Amino acid sequence: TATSGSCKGRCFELQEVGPPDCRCDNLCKSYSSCCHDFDELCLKTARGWECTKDRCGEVRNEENACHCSEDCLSRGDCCTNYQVVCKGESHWVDDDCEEIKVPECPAGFVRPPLIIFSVDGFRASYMKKGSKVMPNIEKLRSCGTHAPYMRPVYPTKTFPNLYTLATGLYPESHGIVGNSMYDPVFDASFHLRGREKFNHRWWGGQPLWITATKQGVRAGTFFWSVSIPHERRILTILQWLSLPDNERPSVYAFYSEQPDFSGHKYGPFGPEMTNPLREIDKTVGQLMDGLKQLRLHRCVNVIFVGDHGMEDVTCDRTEFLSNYLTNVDDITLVPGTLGRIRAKSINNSKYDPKTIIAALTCKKPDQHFKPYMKQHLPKRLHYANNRRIEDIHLLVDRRWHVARKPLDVYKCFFQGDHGFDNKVNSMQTVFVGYGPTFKYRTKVPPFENIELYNVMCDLLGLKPAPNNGTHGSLNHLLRTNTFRPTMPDEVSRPNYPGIMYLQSEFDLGCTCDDKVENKLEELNKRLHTKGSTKERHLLYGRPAVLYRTSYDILYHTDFESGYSEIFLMPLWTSYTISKQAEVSSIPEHLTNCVRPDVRVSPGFSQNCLAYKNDKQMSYGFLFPPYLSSSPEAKYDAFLVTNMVPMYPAFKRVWAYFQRVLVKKYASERNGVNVISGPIFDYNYDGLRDTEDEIKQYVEGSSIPVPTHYYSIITSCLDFTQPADKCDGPLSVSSFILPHRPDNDESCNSSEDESKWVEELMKMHTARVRDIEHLTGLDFYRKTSRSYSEILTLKTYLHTYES
Ligand SMILES: *[C@@H]1O[C@H](CO)[C@@H](O[C@@H]2O[C@H](CO)[C@@H](O[C@@H]3O[C@H](CO[C@H]4O[C@H](CO)[C@@H](O)[C@H](O[C@H]5O[C@H](CO)[C@@H](O)[C@H](O)[C@@H]5O[C@H]5O[C@H](CO)[C@@H](O)[C@H](O)[C@@H]5O)[C@@H]4O)[C@@H](O)[C@H](O[C@H]4O[C@H](CO)[C@@H](O)[C@H](O)[C@@H]4O[C@H]4O[C@H](CO)[C@@H](O)[C@H](O)[C@@H]4O)[C@@H]3O)[C@H](O)[C@H]2NC(C)=O)[C@H](O)[C@H]1NC(C)=O
Ligand SMILES: Cn1c(C#N)cnc1COc1cc(Cl)c(C#N)cc1C(C)(C)C
Ligand SMILES: [Ca+2]
Ligand SMILES: [Ca+2]
Ligand SMILES: [Cl-]
Ligand code: NA
Ligand code: NA
Ligand SMILES: [Zn+2]
């Protein structure tokens, strides 16, 4: 760096200059490459940040941090309180809220600017609890559009979340999978301290600033050097906004290190937290007074957003791997509010992950972490498909830490931390949108930060890069510039087989003990098999298969299914259980009954003999025999086309769901509609496997083994209407349960299922959209609701927090 070129005329230049020409953009500080006079010219502080009566009308003096002279507004560099102090205008916070129906912008603005105001560690409940000391923020919140909270991504750390906001991507796709990382392809490490984090190969996807630039829209800086004071960041944004039309950016970011920085020292609600909240609110007032001075306060869209919350954690709530493993120096742990384990050295072939897992599993009765192979983590976390994520993972209980040994923690500092499971209440953060493009005085439901990239693109007239948002699911935040998606086109149309095979054509090894014989009830069973009850059981139309495959629709009195001829089982099975329905047992004449389905050939069917031979694998049913409507209909549940492969350990789970919980939910929700099926994700990418990806079959057959079993449980949001006769919006909960040959995940599993199955199921709660990615199906195709509303429903996650 030839650091005696000047920064005069160039302070906070938007375009970078190449070495050895010295840099005046921020970042120069983080690369130790600013011109000599950067601090003198670009970080002025003389006289501070506010006009006072004496300074009014002063003679411009270029030394001052900001100006109170007559020319300041045309120059764009007044102190933010200049009109208040010198011109008897009011602060923005003191003005009544007035609806912003249309952008009210100076001439030459082609679109409303967007300012992203990101606040580190701003936990959701600060909006209520800190309301009395945050008047600027409360005005934004109550006059704009807000959610009660915003769900971050896992892990609930800073870079992963801010880079998710910027990209629309899950950490596993963008690459920033933690605040610290090892990449084995690069054989390189990423850390908070230092300079390797600045290398571009860490940062995948396409962040907003590049999407903007590629499409002709200019962007301010996103990263601010920590030494640049907040008042200077604000003033710099206001200055940029005064630029001429061909130079002026349309998108800006402000970042605050608070309240996170104090939160770590004092805890989320320590009495010392009041002042950091006051100071953030002041900064917001500065921006808004600044915008008002420039006539931009009814022209800009402002997004007030956090990265994550903050929880109470102290040194004494640390679990030590040294209390579990005697081999502790054979491993490297990424420690803290999550754990990631790999081998200390890759030439130590002694190392065995399964013995590590086994040594970490349910060893102390209150153990405050749980070990997982990463493919076995809750699919809702989307935290597996990246080489930077170690195969072994520890999910840590809220309020706790994990470390390798006690010398790591005592060689106490802190009272707050974050990083936990992203459904945890303390990790939730905030969203407020304010401006012409946002709605007025509107509350919207909680949503995930992965959704914002699409909105930010909508706000700016950009086409979003491919991302994990569901574009349109946040249209209800927006006054206009909505994105109007169409439903994906069905790729494969189903077959509707009739009766084509005789009983004796099947050699299955299946006994069913069922021979016992009317003409009233013959046309009656015929019409059920042709789809007469189908409107009762298929409430929202059939799911659409979005890939090329061969399948059949099979109708029955109590349930309807799309049966895959390639996978030899259903892709989905749909049934409705009313509030009035009764549970019955499986009779004795039918316990090991499996019956041929005479609509589907022997060659596209499963067989019992494969199950008998497979000593690890048994079978269950997608439509549960327990809930059949009549003894005649119960025969249908024993069709071989309703059977699926299940480990006996998983059958404990599945039986309890089918026998107890479904009926419970129908009572609580006034009927439910259920869609259940299998999921195959052997490469843990969150997407449906092709047949050639499947790693496990039922011994000696072509029957593929699911990695997971899903269910989607839909009812009427107004629960006074029964599920099958609902006029308005819907209510959904779903899960994606791991199909595991043991219940090691559930420490209490030796007890009766009412003590542990429901807990397992809540941990594996899912969005409908997660199931779609995993199955290639598109649900809710025929409802009376608008498509955007259905998109919102598909992104809903039932979290089971209070
Ligand atoms: C969330 O949303 C995202 C974004 O939409 C979804 O991720 C996409 O998933 C797609 C489907 O899996 C995937 O498409 C593949 O792309 C390959 C080309 O990828 C490069 O170019 C793109 C475009 O600029 C870029 O986005 C990619 O960036 C990744 O890679 C770099 C470094 O590796 C990272 O810095 C970056 O973070 C990102 O990493 C992530 O993605 C990769 C996978 O691409 C993961 O491995 C990482 O862990 C991380 O998650 C790339 O720079 C392309 O090569 C693929 O094509 C194969 O597939 C078919 C097979 O029939 C064939 O037509 C092709 O020829 C090719 O097959 C051949 O190669 C095979 C593999 O080498 C080989 O086995 C065969 O034998 C064949 O010869 C494929 O099209 C797309 O890249 C990602 N995009 C991103 C940003 O992640 C994600 O799925 C969503 N999640 C959910 C749950 O919905
Ligand atoms: C985290 N941090 C530090 C530190 N330490 C200094 N400045 C920042 C803000 O960066 C951001 C701010 C926003 Cl608002 C968005 C978004 N969207 C994205 C970023 C990244 C991180 C550049 C990706
Ligand atoms: Ca943070
Ligand atoms: Ca897959
Ligand atoms: Cl981390
Ligand atoms: Na068996
Ligand atoms: Na167990
Ligand atoms: Zn922090």
PDB file of C-alpha atoms in Angstrom, residues 404-635:
ATOM      1  CA  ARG A 404     -13.686 -29.818  25.790  1.00  0.00           C
ATOM      2  CA  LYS A 405     -12.151 -29.510  29.261  1.00  0.00           C
ATOM      3  CA  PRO A 406     -12.317 -27.126  32.180  1.00  0.00           C
ATOM      4  CA  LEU A 407      -8.974 -25.412  31.505  1.00  0.00           C
ATOM      5  CA  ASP A 408     -10.629 -23.996  28.269  1.00  0.00           C
ATOM      6  CA  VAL A 409     -13.216 -22.052  30.340  1.00  0.00           C
ATOM      7  CA  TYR A 410     -11.173 -20.787  33.414  1.00  0.00           C
ATOM      8  CA  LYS A 411      -7.892 -19.904  31.562  1.00  0.00           C
ATOM      9  CA  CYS A 412     -16.475 -15.574  35.229  1.00  0.00           C
ATOM     10  CA  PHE A 413     -16.514 -13.333  32.147  1.00  0.00           C
ATOM     11  CA  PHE A 414     -20.010 -13.349  30.596  1.00  0.00           C
ATOM     12  CA  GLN A 415     -23.658 -13.596  31.426  1.00  0.00           C
ATOM     13  CA  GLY A 416     -25.326 -13.796  27.975  1.00  0.00           C
ATOM     14  CA  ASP A 417     -24.810 -15.894  24.839  1.00  0.00           C
ATOM     15  CA  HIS A 418     -26.644 -17.031  21.706  1.00  0.00           C
ATOM     16  CA  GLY A 419     -26.222 -19.777  19.134  1.00  0.00           C
ATOM     17  CA  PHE A 420     -28.846 -22.236  20.189  1.00  0.00           C
ATOM     18  CA  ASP A 421     -31.594 -23.990  18.283  1.00  0.00           C
ATOM     19  CA  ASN A 422     -33.420 -21.381  16.239  1.00  0.00           C
ATOM     20  CA  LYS A 423     -36.876 -22.235  17.654  1.00  0.00           C
ATOM     21  CA  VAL A 424     -35.806 -21.184  21.153  1.00  0.00           C
ATOM     22  CA  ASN A 425     -37.727 -18.086  22.341  1.00  0.00           C
ATOM     23  CA  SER A 426     -34.682 -16.244  23.635  1.00  0.00           C
ATOM     24  CA  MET A 427     -32.992 -16.470  20.201  1.00  0.00           C
ATOM     25  CA  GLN A 428     -35.896 -14.817  18.342  1.00  0.00           C
ATOM     26  CA  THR A 429     -35.337 -11.367  16.974  1.00  0.00           C
ATOM     27  CA  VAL A 430     -37.176  -8.424  15.393  1.00  0.00           C
ATOM     28  CA  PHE A 431     -38.658  -7.168  12.181  1.00  0.00           C
ATOM     29  CA  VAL A 432     -40.148  -3.797  11.425  1.00  0.00           C
ATOM     30  CA  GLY A 433     -40.710  -2.394   7.934  1.00  0.00           C
ATOM     31  CA  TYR A 434     -41.511   1.295   7.532  1.00  0.00           C
ATOM     32  CA  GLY A 435     -42.107   3.220   4.341  1.00  0.00           C
ATOM     33  CA  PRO A 436     -44.278   3.760   1.241  1.00  0.00           C
ATOM     34  CA  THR A 437     -43.961   0.114   0.134  1.00  0.00           C
ATOM     35  CA  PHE A 438     -44.818  -1.379   3.477  1.00  0.00           C
ATOM     36  CA  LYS A 439     -48.278  -1.493   4.959  1.00  0.00           C
ATOM     37  CA  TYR A 440     -49.600   0.968   7.505  1.00  0.00           C
ATOM     38  CA  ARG A 441     -50.176   0.035  11.172  1.00  0.00           C
ATOM     39  CA  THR A 442     -50.115  -3.616  10.370  1.00  0.00           C
ATOM     40  CA  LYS A 443     -49.101  -6.650  12.393  1.00  0.00           C
ATOM     41  CA  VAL A 444     -48.055  -9.711  10.466  1.00  0.00           C
ATOM     42  CA  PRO A 445     -47.324 -13.203  11.868  1.00  0.00           C
ATOM     43  CA  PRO A 446     -43.805 -14.362  12.762  1.00  0.00           C
ATOM     44  CA  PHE A 447     -41.720 -15.445   9.767  1.00  0.00           C
ATOM     45  CA  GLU A 448     -38.142 -16.615   8.996  1.00  0.00           C
ATOM     46  CA  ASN A 449     -35.305 -14.350   8.028  1.00  0.00           C
ATOM     47  CA  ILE A 450     -34.571 -16.457   4.907  1.00  0.00           C
ATOM     48  CA  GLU A 451     -37.732 -14.809   3.432  1.00  0.00           C
ATOM     49  CA  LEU A 452     -36.437 -11.232   3.481  1.00  0.00           C
ATOM     50  CA  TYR A 453     -33.975 -11.367   0.547  1.00  0.00           C
ATOM     51  CA  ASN A 454     -36.947 -11.900  -1.858  1.00  0.00           C
ATOM     52  CA  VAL A 455     -38.749  -8.901  -0.289  1.00  0.00           C
ATOM     53  CA  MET A 456     -35.714  -6.730  -0.405  1.00  0.00           C
ATOM     54  CA  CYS A 457     -35.453  -7.587  -4.046  1.00  0.00           C
ATOM     55  CA  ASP A 458     -39.125  -6.774  -4.553  1.00  0.00           C
ATOM     56  CA  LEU A 459     -38.568  -3.391  -2.794  1.00  0.00           C
ATOM     57  CA  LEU A 460     -35.810  -2.586  -5.227  1.00  0.00           C
ATOM     58  CA  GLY A 461     -37.220  -3.926  -8.540  1.00  0.00           C
ATOM     59  CA  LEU A 462     -34.685  -6.731  -8.722  1.00  0.00           C
ATOM     60  CA  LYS A 463     -35.002 -10.333  -9.784  1.00  0.00           C
ATOM     61  CA  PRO A 464     -33.781 -12.453  -6.809  1.00  0.00           C
ATOM     62  CA  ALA A 465     -31.019 -15.019  -7.327  1.00  0.00           C
ATOM     63  CA  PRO A 466     -32.157 -18.612  -6.558  1.00  0.00           C
ATOM     64  CA  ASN A 467     -32.694 -18.877  -2.795  1.00  0.00           C
ATOM     65  CA  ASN A 468     -34.541 -20.693   0.031  1.00  0.00           C
ATOM     66  CA  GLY A 469     -37.208 -18.130   0.524  1.00  0.00           C
ATOM     67  CA  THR A 470     -40.672 -18.886  -0.836  1.00  0.00           C
ATOM     68  CA  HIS A 471     -41.289 -15.877  -3.018  1.00  0.00           C
ATOM     69  CA  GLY A 472     -44.728 -14.491  -2.331  1.00  0.00           C
ATOM     70  CA  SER A 473     -45.088 -15.864   1.189  1.00  0.00           C
ATOM     71  CA  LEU A 474     -44.443 -12.312   2.528  1.00  0.00           C
ATOM     72  CA  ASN A 475     -46.688 -10.420   0.078  1.00  0.00           C
ATOM     73  CA  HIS A 476     -48.913  -9.520   3.030  1.00  0.00           C
ATOM     74  CA  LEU A 477     -46.234  -7.158   4.351  1.00  0.00           C
ATOM     75  CA  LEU A 478     -46.409  -5.014   1.291  1.00  0.00           C
ATOM     76  CA  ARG A 479     -48.687  -2.262   0.134  1.00  0.00           C
ATOM     77  CA  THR A 480     -47.502  -2.840  -3.480  1.00  0.00           C
ATOM     78  CA  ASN A 481     -44.661  -4.459  -5.600  1.00  0.00           C
ATOM     79  CA  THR A 482     -46.048  -7.791  -4.655  1.00  0.00           C
ATOM     80  CA  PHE A 483     -44.684 -10.812  -6.536  1.00  0.00           C
ATOM     81  CA  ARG A 484     -47.436 -12.821  -8.106  1.00  0.00           C
ATOM     82  CA  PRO A 485     -46.280 -16.409  -8.414  1.00  0.00           C
ATOM     83  CA  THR A 486     -48.027 -19.212 -10.299  1.00  0.00           C
ATOM     84  CA  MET A 487     -48.280 -22.774  -8.906  1.00  0.00           C
ATOM     85  CA  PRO A 488     -45.626 -25.104 -10.294  1.00  0.00           C
ATOM     86  CA  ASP A 489     -46.908 -27.235 -13.211  1.00  0.00           C
ATOM     87  CA  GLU A 490     -47.489 -30.938 -12.503  1.00  0.00           C
ATOM     88  CA  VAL A 491     -44.891 -33.057 -14.318  1.00  0.00           C
ATOM     89  CA  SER A 492     -46.427 -36.509 -13.969  1.00  0.00           C
ATOM     90  CA  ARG A 493     -50.078 -37.238 -14.327  1.00  0.00           C
ATOM     91  CA  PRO A 494     -51.352 -40.174 -12.329  1.00  0.00           C
ATOM     92  CA  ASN A 495     -52.800 -43.467 -13.524  1.00  0.00           C
ATOM     93  CA  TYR A 496     -56.155 -44.508 -12.127  1.00  0.00           C
ATOM     94  CA  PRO A 497     -56.005 -48.345 -12.212  1.00  0.00           C
ATOM     95  CA  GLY A 498     -59.136 -50.409 -11.848  1.00  0.00           C
ATOM     96  CA  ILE A 499     -59.213 -54.126 -10.918  1.00  0.00           C
ATOM     97  CA  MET A 500     -56.660 -55.801 -13.234  1.00  0.00           C
ATOM     98  CA  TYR A 501     -55.202 -58.744 -11.256  1.00  0.00           C
ATOM     99  CA  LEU A 502     -56.419 -61.957  -9.681  1.00  0.00           C
ATOM    100  CA  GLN A 503     -55.477 -62.995  -6.154  1.00  0.00           C
ATOM    101  CA  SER A 504     -53.536 -66.101  -7.290  1.00  0.00           C
ATOM    102  CA  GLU A 505     -51.233 -64.021  -9.478  1.00  0.00           C
ATOM    103  CA  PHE A 506     -49.602 -62.768  -6.234  1.00  0.00           C
ATOM    104  CA  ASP A 507     -46.971 -64.806  -4.423  1.00  0.00           C
ATOM    105  CA  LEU A 508     -46.152 -62.520  -1.486  1.00  0.00           C
ATOM    106  CA  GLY A 509     -45.630 -64.739   1.575  1.00  0.00           C
ATOM    107  CA  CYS A 510     -48.470 -62.756   3.119  1.00  0.00           C
ATOM    108  CA  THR A 511     -51.223 -64.506   4.962  1.00  0.00           C
ATOM    109  CA  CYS A 512     -54.480 -62.765   5.448  1.00  0.00           C
ATOM    110  CA  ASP A 513     -57.170 -64.790   7.266  1.00  0.00           C
ATOM    111  CA  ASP A 514     -60.179 -62.979   5.685  1.00  0.00           C
ATOM    112  CA  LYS A 515     -62.542 -65.112   3.440  1.00  0.00           C
ATOM    113  CA  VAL A 516     -66.056 -64.268   4.860  1.00  0.00           C
ATOM    114  CA  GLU A 517     -68.649 -62.747   2.321  1.00  0.00           C
ATOM    115  CA  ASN A 518     -75.063 -58.556  -0.395  1.00  0.00           C
ATOM    116  CA  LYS A 519     -75.924 -56.371  -3.465  1.00  0.00           C
ATOM    117  CA  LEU A 520     -76.747 -53.039  -1.597  1.00  0.00           C
ATOM    118  CA  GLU A 521     -73.127 -53.021  -0.271  1.00  0.00           C
ATOM    119  CA  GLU A 522     -71.482 -54.280  -3.548  1.00  0.00           C
ATOM    120  CA  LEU A 523     -72.245 -51.081  -5.549  1.00  0.00           C
ATOM    121  CA  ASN A 524     -71.400 -49.297  -2.207  1.00  0.00           C
ATOM    122  CA  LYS A 525     -67.764 -50.745  -2.065  1.00  0.00           C
ATOM    123  CA  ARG A 526     -67.380 -50.254  -5.883  1.00  0.00           C
ATOM    124  CA  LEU A 527     -68.207 -46.523  -5.606  1.00  0.00           C
ATOM    125  CA  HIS A 528     -65.751 -46.059  -2.672  1.00  0.00           C
ATOM    126  CA  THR A 529     -63.047 -47.729  -4.842  1.00  0.00           C
ATOM    127  CA  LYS A 530     -63.991 -45.286  -7.693  1.00  0.00           C
ATOM    128  CA  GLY A 531     -63.599 -42.227  -5.381  1.00  0.00           C
ATOM    129  CA  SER A 532     -67.042 -41.401  -3.821  1.00  0.00           C
ATOM    130  CA  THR A 533     -65.696 -40.364  -0.349  1.00  0.00           C
ATOM    131  CA  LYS A 534     -62.675 -38.662  -1.988  1.00  0.00           C
ATOM    132  CA  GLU A 535     -64.024 -35.121  -1.168  1.00  0.00           C
ATOM    133  CA  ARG A 536     -64.023 -36.045   2.507  1.00  0.00           C
ATOM    134  CA  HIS A 537     -60.392 -37.270   2.481  1.00  0.00           C
ATOM    135  CA  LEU A 538     -58.731 -35.182  -0.098  1.00  0.00           C
ATOM    136  CA  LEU A 539     -59.721 -31.710   1.097  1.00  0.00           C
ATOM    137  CA  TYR A 540     -57.303 -29.500  -0.743  1.00  0.00           C
ATOM    138  CA  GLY A 541     -56.984 -31.356  -4.001  1.00  0.00           C
ATOM    139  CA  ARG A 542     -54.418 -33.998  -4.811  1.00  0.00           C
ATOM    140  CA  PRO A 543     -50.790 -33.086  -4.408  1.00  0.00           C
ATOM    141  CA  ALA A 544     -49.016 -32.442  -7.648  1.00  0.00           C
ATOM    142  CA  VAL A 545     -46.001 -34.539  -8.482  1.00  0.00           C
ATOM    143  CA  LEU A 546     -43.295 -32.182  -9.717  1.00  0.00           C
ATOM    144  CA  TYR A 547     -40.902 -34.701 -11.275  1.00  0.00           C
ATOM    145  CA  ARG A 548     -41.040 -37.497 -13.873  1.00  0.00           C
ATOM    146  CA  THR A 549     -42.326 -40.758 -12.347  1.00  0.00           C
ATOM    147  CA  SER A 550     -44.933 -43.532 -12.645  1.00  0.00           C
ATOM    148  CA  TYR A 551     -47.730 -43.527 -10.119  1.00  0.00           C
ATOM    149  CA  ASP A 552     -51.343 -44.463  -9.406  1.00  0.00           C
ATOM    150  CA  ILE A 553     -54.175 -42.883  -7.534  1.00  0.00           C
ATOM    151  CA  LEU A 554     -55.847 -45.458  -5.296  1.00  0.00           C
ATOM    152  CA  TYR A 555     -59.235 -44.682  -3.704  1.00  0.00           C
ATOM    153  CA  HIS A 556     -60.695 -46.207  -0.581  1.00  0.00           C
ATOM    154  CA  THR A 557     -63.556 -45.606   1.848  1.00  0.00           C
ATOM    155  CA  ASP A 558     -61.304 -44.004   4.495  1.00  0.00           C
ATOM    156  CA  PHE A 559     -58.230 -42.731   2.567  1.00  0.00           C
ATOM    157  CA  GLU A 560     -56.790 -41.890  -0.820  1.00  0.00           C
ATOM    158  CA  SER A 561     -53.120 -42.439  -1.954  1.00  0.00           C
ATOM    159  CA  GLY A 562     -50.690 -41.744  -4.769  1.00  0.00           C
ATOM    160  CA  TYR A 563     -48.857 -45.082  -4.992  1.00  0.00           C
ATOM    161  CA  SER A 564     -45.369 -45.063  -6.538  1.00  0.00           C
ATOM    162  CA  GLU A 565     -44.657 -47.971  -8.885  1.00  0.00           C
ATOM    163  CA  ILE A 566     -40.942 -47.099  -8.700  1.00  0.00           C
ATOM    164  CA  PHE A 567     -40.630 -46.949  -4.896  1.00  0.00           C
ATOM    165  CA  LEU A 568     -43.288 -49.688  -4.293  1.00  0.00           C
ATOM    166  CA  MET A 569     -45.223 -47.578  -1.727  1.00  0.00           C
ATOM    167  CA  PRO A 570     -47.180 -44.374  -1.413  1.00  0.00           C
ATOM    168  CA  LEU A 571     -45.699 -40.970  -2.045  1.00  0.00           C
ATOM    169  CA  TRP A 572     -48.578 -39.685   0.001  1.00  0.00           C
ATOM    170  CA  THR A 573     -51.733 -40.919   1.770  1.00  0.00           C
ATOM    171  CA  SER A 574     -54.540 -38.440   2.670  1.00  0.00           C
ATOM    172  CA  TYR A 575     -57.371 -38.951   5.163  1.00  0.00           C
ATOM    173  CA  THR A 576     -59.732 -36.938   7.371  1.00  0.00           C
ATOM    174  CA  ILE A 577     -60.611 -37.738  10.945  1.00  0.00           C
ATOM    175  CA  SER A 578     -63.603 -35.894  12.391  1.00  0.00           C
ATOM    176  CA  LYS A 579     -63.989 -34.833  16.005  1.00  0.00           C
ATOM    177  CA  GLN A 580     -66.528 -37.656  16.399  1.00  0.00           C
ATOM    178  CA  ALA A 581     -64.337 -40.507  14.978  1.00  0.00           C
ATOM    179  CA  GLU A 582     -63.612 -43.552  17.161  1.00  0.00           C
ATOM    180  CA  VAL A 583     -60.441 -45.608  17.509  1.00  0.00           C
ATOM    181  CA  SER A 584     -60.695 -49.382  17.372  1.00  0.00           C
ATOM    182  CA  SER A 585     -58.088 -52.044  17.789  1.00  0.00           C
ATOM    183  CA  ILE A 586     -56.552 -54.294  15.188  1.00  0.00           C
ATOM    184  CA  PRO A 587     -58.593 -57.554  15.346  1.00  0.00           C
ATOM    185  CA  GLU A 588     -56.921 -60.959  15.674  1.00  0.00           C
ATOM    186  CA  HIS A 589     -58.069 -62.363  12.319  1.00  0.00           C
ATOM    187  CA  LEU A 590     -55.925 -59.484  10.813  1.00  0.00           C
ATOM    188  CA  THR A 591     -52.761 -58.982  12.965  1.00  0.00           C
ATOM    189  CA  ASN A 592     -50.241 -60.177  10.296  1.00  0.00           C
ATOM    190  CA  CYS A 593     -52.701 -59.853   7.443  1.00  0.00           C
ATOM    191  CA  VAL A 594     -51.372 -58.162   4.324  1.00  0.00           C
ATOM    192  CA  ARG A 595     -53.643 -58.345   1.285  1.00  0.00           C
ATOM    193  CA  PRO A 596     -52.815 -58.035  -2.408  1.00  0.00           C
ATOM    194  CA  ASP A 597     -54.143 -54.907  -4.060  1.00  0.00           C
ATOM    195  CA  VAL A 598     -55.792 -56.198  -7.184  1.00  0.00           C
ATOM    196  CA  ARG A 599     -55.400 -52.803  -8.966  1.00  0.00           C
ATOM    197  CA  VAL A 600     -51.534 -52.963  -8.836  1.00  0.00           C
ATOM    198  CA  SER A 601     -49.381 -55.694 -10.326  1.00  0.00           C
ATOM    199  CA  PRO A 602     -47.440 -58.231  -8.260  1.00  0.00           C
ATOM    200  CA  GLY A 603     -44.279 -56.785  -9.847  1.00  0.00           C
ATOM    201  CA  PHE A 604     -44.990 -53.278  -8.499  1.00  0.00           C
ATOM    202  CA  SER A 605     -45.876 -54.491  -5.032  1.00  0.00           C
ATOM    203  CA  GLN A 606     -44.041 -55.203  -1.825  1.00  0.00           C
ATOM    204  CA  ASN A 607     -43.972 -58.724  -0.300  1.00  0.00           C
ATOM    205  CA  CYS A 608     -44.010 -60.059   3.251  1.00  0.00           C
ATOM    206  CA  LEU A 609     -41.238 -62.546   2.720  1.00  0.00           C
ATOM    207  CA  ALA A 610     -38.647 -59.793   2.370  1.00  0.00           C
ATOM    208  CA  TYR A 611     -39.751 -58.469   5.776  1.00  0.00           C
ATOM    209  CA  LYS A 612     -39.605 -61.953   7.342  1.00  0.00           C
ATOM    210  CA  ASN A 613     -36.132 -62.398   6.030  1.00  0.00           C
ATOM    211  CA  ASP A 614     -35.078 -58.905   7.119  1.00  0.00           C
ATOM    212  CA  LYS A 615     -34.415 -59.411  10.783  1.00  0.00           C
ATOM    213  CA  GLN A 616     -33.878 -55.680  11.444  1.00  0.00           C
ATOM    214  CA  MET A 617     -36.821 -54.322   9.426  1.00  0.00           C
ATOM    215  CA  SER A 618     -40.521 -54.657  10.038  1.00  0.00           C
ATOM    216  CA  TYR A 619     -43.481 -52.761   8.497  1.00  0.00           C
ATOM    217  CA  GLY A 620     -46.219 -50.271   9.369  1.00  0.00           C
ATOM    218  CA  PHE A 621     -49.117 -48.599   7.552  1.00  0.00           C
ATOM    219  CA  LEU A 622     -49.639 -45.093   6.297  1.00  0.00           C
ATOM    220  CA  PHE A 623     -53.363 -45.063   6.801  1.00  0.00           C
ATOM    221  CA  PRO A 624     -53.729 -46.376  10.321  1.00  0.00           C
ATOM    222  CA  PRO A 625     -55.983 -49.411  10.770  1.00  0.00           C
ATOM    223  CA  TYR A 626     -56.904 -48.076  14.279  1.00  0.00           C
ATOM    224  CA  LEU A 627     -59.044 -45.340  12.592  1.00  0.00           C
ATOM    225  CA  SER A 628     -61.010 -47.291   9.984  1.00  0.00           C
ATOM    226  CA  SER A 629     -64.672 -46.212   9.734  1.00  0.00           C
ATOM    227  CA  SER A 630     -66.244 -49.651   9.881  1.00  0.00           C
ATOM    228  CA  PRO A 631     -65.080 -53.275  10.039  1.00  0.00           C
ATOM    229  CA  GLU A 632     -65.535 -53.674   6.224  1.00  0.00           C
ATOM    230  CA  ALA A 633     -63.338 -50.612   5.524  1.00  0.00           C
ATOM    231  CA  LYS A 634     -60.709 -51.906   7.929  1.00  0.00           C
ATOM    232  CA  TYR A 635     -59.717 -54.526   5.312  1.00  0.00           C
TER     233      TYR A 635
END
